């Protein structure tokens, strides 16, 4: 029985005139409350029990960290078969609190249920019911309640609390509330209408209902909330699809009509995965002179500069092998660039129909058109691969594709 002294309390007696009780108390509770053991004589005869400190706890164990075991001895209660006496623990001082709850001034309406939303062309009718009672209990009538519905998206926190109310168990959520492609969530609480019984906290929020809003254009930026700070900065809370942002880079432009178009910083802050909001701090030195700033969010002119003379890649040359006296040479099909004087480095590769290109000889030289070699008894061995590169101060490019293995 929870209470420690009760929990650990065993009273052993002998059919003579000696009944000992052993219980304990927690040393912590001691500095707040102290209790005295009490025996039930017959009824209003709550005769107290004398108890002296003890160190040992044999009859029962104490589940506390620091207990104050006690041993109590009580006199002849004249033992006889079927004799039961009750023990209680009386606190040193009267404890408790009271509260006169005048029903009317402490009413908490029941929570709504059967929350459902039926859409009707970019409009959502949120319906619900409330179990008032059974026999027409005139105490509380539906005309005594008020409803507070809160709604948001399956992303943001309820702290933004976009509330709405109704005197009927129905609300009309539309385009002027929800935004075009977001999945919303809403719940309802039952309040006490001004015409009422009296005060009382409103019910607890009902289960929330989820639904997708009006069809819209995804892959578009949303929530262009811009809030003017004091009198020097204007912060805007951007919002774009975490997939569009990986193909379309957007920027925040602003023009105070009656033009500048970017901010020094555009910090990205990841939202609920599916979305990534951005921020920018637009400076505003003349708030009085220019109190109109039409901000916009469109594709930022993001371009990659490619320098021709640095991103070169020549075409693979031809080879056609020549064999006079002792086969060795290799022809270089230089793609005659119109009288353009540029140095070229080549990479020729050896081989054999019995080996892979990973074990070839790569003689790399400049402005050459052939090389030397000492073959063997094979005359159907592969060994024709040539790469060209810009080995001039026309600084750089990339290895050209390979030529073709002229099986000789």
Ligand X SMILES: *C1O[C@H](CO[C@@H]2O[C@@H](C)[C@@H](O)[C@@H](O)[C@@H]2O)[C@@H](O[C@@H]2O[C@H](CO)[C@@H](O)[C@H](O)[C@H]2NC(C)=O)[C@H](O)[C@H]1NC(C)=O
Ligand Y SMILES: *C1O[C@H](CO)[C@@H](O[C@@H]2O[C@H](CO)[C@@H](O[C@@H]3O[C@H](CO)[C@@H](O)[C@H](O)[C@@H]3O)[C@H](O)[C@H]2NC(C)=O)[C@H](O)[C@H]1NC(C)=O
Q: Which does 361 bind (CB under 5 to 8 A by kind): its own copies, ligand X, ligand Y, none?
A: none
Instruction: Answer with the entry of its own copies, ligand X, ligand Y, none that 84 interacts with (C-beta below 5 to 8 A by kind).
Output: its own copies
Rounded distance, CA 241 to CA 222, Å? 9
Rounded distance between C-alpha atoms, residue 51 and residue 32, angstroms: 19
- 31: contact with ligand Y by CB under 6 A: yes
Q: HEC states along 248-268? A: CCEEEEEECCCCCCCCCCCCE
Q: According to CB under 6 A, which residues from 88 to 107 bind ligand Y?
A: 92
Task: Closer to ligand Y by CB, 7 or 36: give it.
Answer: 36
In the bound state with ligand X, the residue whose beta carbon lies nearer, of 65 and 194, is 194
Nearest to 386 by CA among 366, 364, 367: 364
Q: Which stretch binds ligand Y (CB under 6 A): 24-32, 176-184, 220-228, 284-292?
A: 24-32
Nearer to its own copies, 58 or 325 (CB): 58
Task: Confirm or reject binding of residue 30 to ligand Y (CB under 6 A).
Answer: yes
Q: Residue with CB nearest ligand X? A: 167
Candidates 6-14, 30-38, 323-331, 394-402 — which segment interacts with ligand Y by CB under 6 A? 30-38
The one of ligand Y, ligand X, its own copies, none whose footprint includes residue 292, by CB under 5 to 8 A per kind, is its own copies
For ligand Y, the closer of residues 31 and 341 by Cβ is 31
β-partners of residue 282 are 234
Which does residue 167 bind out of ligand Y, its own copies, ligand X, none, counting CB within 5 to 8 angstroms by kind?
A: ligand X
Query: Which whole-number Å values give the CA distances from 178 to 175, 184, 186, in the listed order?
Result: 5, 8, 11
Give the interface segment with ligand Y, choosing from 11-19, 25-33, 41-49, 206-214 (CB under 6 A): 25-33
Least distance from ligand Y to the Cβ atom of residue 239, Å: 19
The tokens describing 203, both together, are 């019910």
Residue (92 or 120) nearer to ligand Y, CB: 92
In the complex, minimum distance from the CB of residue 276 to ligand X, in angstroms, rounded to a whole number:
36
Phi/psi at 173 (nearest 5 deg)?
Answer: -90, 125
Nearest to 209, CA basis, from 114, 138, 119: 114
* Binder of ligand X out of 167, 170, 298, 364 (CB under 6 A): 167
Q: Toward its own copies, which CB reaches closer, 263 or 381?
A: 263
Residue 25 contacts residue 80 (beta carbons within 8 Å): no
The per-residue b/e assignment along 170-187, b for 16 or more CB within 10 angstroms, e otherwise, is ebebeeebbeebbebbbb
Asked whether position 33 contacts ligand Y by CB under 6 A, the answer is yes
CA dihedral of 79, 83, 84, 87, whole degrees rounded to 10: -20
The reply to whether 302 sits near ligand Y by the rule CB under 6 A is no
* DSSP assignment letter at 120: -
Are 296 and 263 spatial neighbours (Cβ–Cβ below 8 Å)? no
Q: Which of 181/329 has CB closer to its own copies?
A: 181
Q: Which residues bind ligand Y (CB under 6 A)?
A: 30-34, 92
């Amino acid at each position: 029985e929870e209470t420690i002294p009760l929990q650990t309390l065993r009273c052993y007696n002998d059919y003579t005139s000696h009944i000992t009780c052993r219980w304990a108390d927690t040393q912590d509770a001691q500095r707040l409350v102290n209790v005295t053991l009490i025996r039930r004589v017959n009824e209003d005869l709550l005769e107290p029990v004398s108890c002296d400190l003890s160190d040992d706890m044999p009859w029962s164990a104490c589940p506390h960290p620091r207990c104050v075991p006690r041993r109590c001895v009580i006199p002849c209660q004249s033992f006889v078969v079927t004799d039961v006496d009750y023990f209680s623990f009386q606190p040193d001082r009267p404890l408790g609190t009271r509260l006169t709850v005048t029903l009317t001034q402490h009413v908490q309406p029941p929570e709504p249920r059967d929350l459902q939303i039926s859409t009707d062309q970019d409009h959502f009718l949120l319906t619900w019911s409330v179990a008032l009672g059974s026999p027409q209990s005139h105490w509380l009538s539906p005309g005594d309640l008020e409803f507070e519905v809160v709604y948001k998206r399956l992303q943001d926190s309820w702290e933004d609390a976009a509330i709405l109310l109704s005197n009927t168990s129905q609300a009309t959520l539309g385009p002027e509330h929800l935004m075009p492609s977001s999945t919303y969530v809403a719940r309802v609480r039952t309040r006490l209408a001004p015409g009422s019984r009296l005060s009382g906290r409103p019910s607890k929020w009902s289960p929330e209902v989820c639904w997708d809003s009006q069809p819209g254009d995804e892959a578009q930026p949303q929530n262009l909330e811009c809030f003017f700070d004091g009198a020097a900065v204007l912060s805007c809370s951007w919002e774009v699809r975490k997939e569009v942002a990986s193909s379309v880079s957007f920027g925040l432009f602003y023009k105070p009509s009656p033009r500048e178009e970017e901010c020094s910083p555009v910090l990205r802050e990841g939202l609920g995965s599916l979305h990534t909001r951005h921020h920018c701090q637009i400076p505003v030195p003349d708030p009085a002179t220019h109190g109109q700033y039409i901000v916009s969010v469109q594709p930022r002119r993001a371009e990659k500069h490619i320098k021709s003379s640095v991103n070169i890649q020549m075409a693979p040359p031809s080879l056609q092998v020549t064999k006079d006296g002792d086969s060795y040479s290799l022809r270089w099909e230089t793609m005659k660039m119109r009288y353009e004087h540029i140095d070229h480095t080549f990479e020729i590769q050896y081989r054999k129909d019995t080996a892979t290109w990973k074990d070839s000889k790569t003689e790399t030289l400049q402005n050459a058109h052939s090389m030397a070699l000492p073959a063997l008894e094979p005359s159907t061995r592969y060994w024709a691969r040539v790469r060209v590169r810009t080995s001039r101060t026309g600084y750089n490019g990339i290895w050209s594709e390979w030529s073709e293995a002229r099986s000789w």
